[model samples]
Target chain A: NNPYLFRSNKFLTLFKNQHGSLRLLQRFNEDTEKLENLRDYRVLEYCSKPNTLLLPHHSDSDLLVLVLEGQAILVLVNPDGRDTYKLDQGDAIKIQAGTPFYLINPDNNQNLRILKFAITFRRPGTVEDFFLSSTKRLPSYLSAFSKNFLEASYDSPYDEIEQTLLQEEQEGVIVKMP
Target chain B: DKPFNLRSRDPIYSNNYGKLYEITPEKNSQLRDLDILLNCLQMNEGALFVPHYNSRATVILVANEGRAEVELVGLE
Candidate 1:
């Protein structure tokens, strides 16, 4: 049977709102012999309707991102500093595995399209995206920490941490900037 | 209004054994207005075409005359 042709309609929506959507072309692994070259990578597509922000997140795989259309503001946060790039059509960049980053479609009249090729490091043919900001449906990893640990780390009372850090993000993963 | 000679145009990408030619709105306004694109790939013996996907376009591949093994990745 044909095991290589994936239709655009088959994309799985990872996240979406009125402003943007992140979609993944699910990897095929049933017949490893046929897909040997693709067993270590995944394909992701991101589309922003305009004036939208994709929240900060990090993935377990190293990423090669290609801007397909429109203007994008990409912010990559480093351990010691932060850098930004203004990307347009045909612009490509490599993101190190586990690097925190966010993207913005700054154009008010044009949409943004991005294609991402991710090379898995932690798992073969798999990628895990951890978002720094979360809503009720998606809880931040910080919520998993003990209340006392969180309080001590932030140097604030647990009530304050709960009120500020753990509060619901009503806007979701991708939100309209204005 | 004229027949765009895809073969006469220089290939977008070329190597020792393979060449990829594309026809899109950039080359022909008719194709752009119609929201269509075409790509042609010529490969020599033993050459491998890396698997890739389009961001928003549906693609159909046509082989004029060749004997090569092709693989596709799918969810089901």
Candidate 2:
């Protein structure tokens, strides 16, 4: 497949954020004539530093991870019980939908390379990633709740909770290692 | 089944940092039973991805360089 095989420096870069840079192949179904099963998926190529991390998040679709380079620690974020694993060259792992997880690179010297294929669900030709931690407090509180409801649940004042949720970071999901 | 070149297809969207490519069985009969969609993404060293959930499918992410930290949402 001509399109199936892509070369680095051959494709154009899309945008840069805190996590790094991105180029996404969205709305793939349209080109393939609306492949019912494969419509929502998008492929990804990414690079990042060690200290920076992907915030706790989950998507509607399941994820298959293949590490191309470097060493990483994949933390299966479970408040009740956590699962962590090490991913080295040629390593692979599956992250089910709704299961929150984060990746870590302890080595600061070498860069970690990886290939990500997201199998999306619900919305065809599209998949969404929901983050539990990013700005500090919580995205839920940005507009939906009143301080009173928060007060009832939290020991600290609503303002305090808000402060924690709103940490200052340029990147929300992918952060620099340093 | 003939594999359609991802680069041969038009892009859905792109910018300076990266570009995305997509493919599906609808265009290629060989993929019909595969029940899978394919997208290709390229990213630099300081960008970030949005947070979202899937109503139905499972996703797999592969890194080409500089390891990526995969984060999932906490239990609802």
Candidate 3:
């Protein structure tokens, strides 16, 4: 019933709710003239699980997450170590592109639901580049003396690292995809 | 068997559904009404499905049942 200037392919259906029944809703991708340039967004309902794990990884563009319902434990690891951030309903967090982080469900009884956003339409850059880049070694991105710190390590390759780092430095922010 | 129990939970999860309405633009019908629809969608819980302002992006999340928690994640 609602109409707007933005054009999109509309799709409506009955989806399963948390209690395990049908709920009607509509969803579609935004219609933009520059679809290629457009980033992607999604809405999720009725979340409450722990075993769901997102391995540590990084993106090429800025990413944001908003907690629409329930709570979650978000962990970000820098050169220092893993730092956990707890998010409740209405809370929003932004992870700069290329930072390794993971999400965990600390609650046993409740399912977590959240809305995620990213700035680019393309796939994120690989985490391997972070370790393979010449300017710095694998240990540089890891936390201080952690298990990963002790295991497999290598120094940054100056030429490769410098090439990537210099471009990022010049651009201020690097958009991984064309 | 549990109609009342089902009804009890309706208000919380049911009301979040996006409501659709029809609008027609005539020569004199200014574009203001279009802005109104945009505003309503942005204000509603269903806003998550809409694209971010000034960005060609979509969001994805995993919603599990039981505790009512949602985890926002990227799909691609």
Best by lDDT: 1
Interface root-mean-square deviation, candidate 2: 11.4
Where does candidate 1 chain A have its weakest 10-residue lDDT segment? Answer: A28-37
What digit string (tens of lDDT, one per residue) describes model 3 on residues A21-127?
11112222244333332223322222335434433556565555556556677787788776778776555566666777766556656655654444443452211
CA-based DockQ, model 1 = 0.05
The runs of at least 3 residues in candidate 2 whose Cα sits more than 4 Å from the true structure, single-residue gaps closed, are A1-19, A32-37, A135-144, A167-171, B1-76
Fnat, one value per model:
0.00, 0.05, 0.00
In candidate 2 the C-alpha lDDT for residue A142 amounts to 37
lDDT by residue for model 1 (B1-76), tens: 2223344468988998899877776666645644556566789999997888778765545334467687766664
Q: Score the docking of each candidate (DockQ).
A: 0.05, 0.05, 0.04
| Model 3 lDDT on a 0 to 1 scale | 0.38
Q: Per-model TM-score of chain A alone?
A: 0.94, 0.76, 0.47
Candidate ordering by lDDT (highest first): 1, 2, 3
- Which digits, one per residue and each the tens of the lDDT, describe model 2 over residues B1-76? 1113445577665867667766565765434444555566766666565577756554444444475655565432
- Estimated TM-score for each candidate: 0.71, 0.58, 0.38
Better of 2 and 3 by TM-score: 2
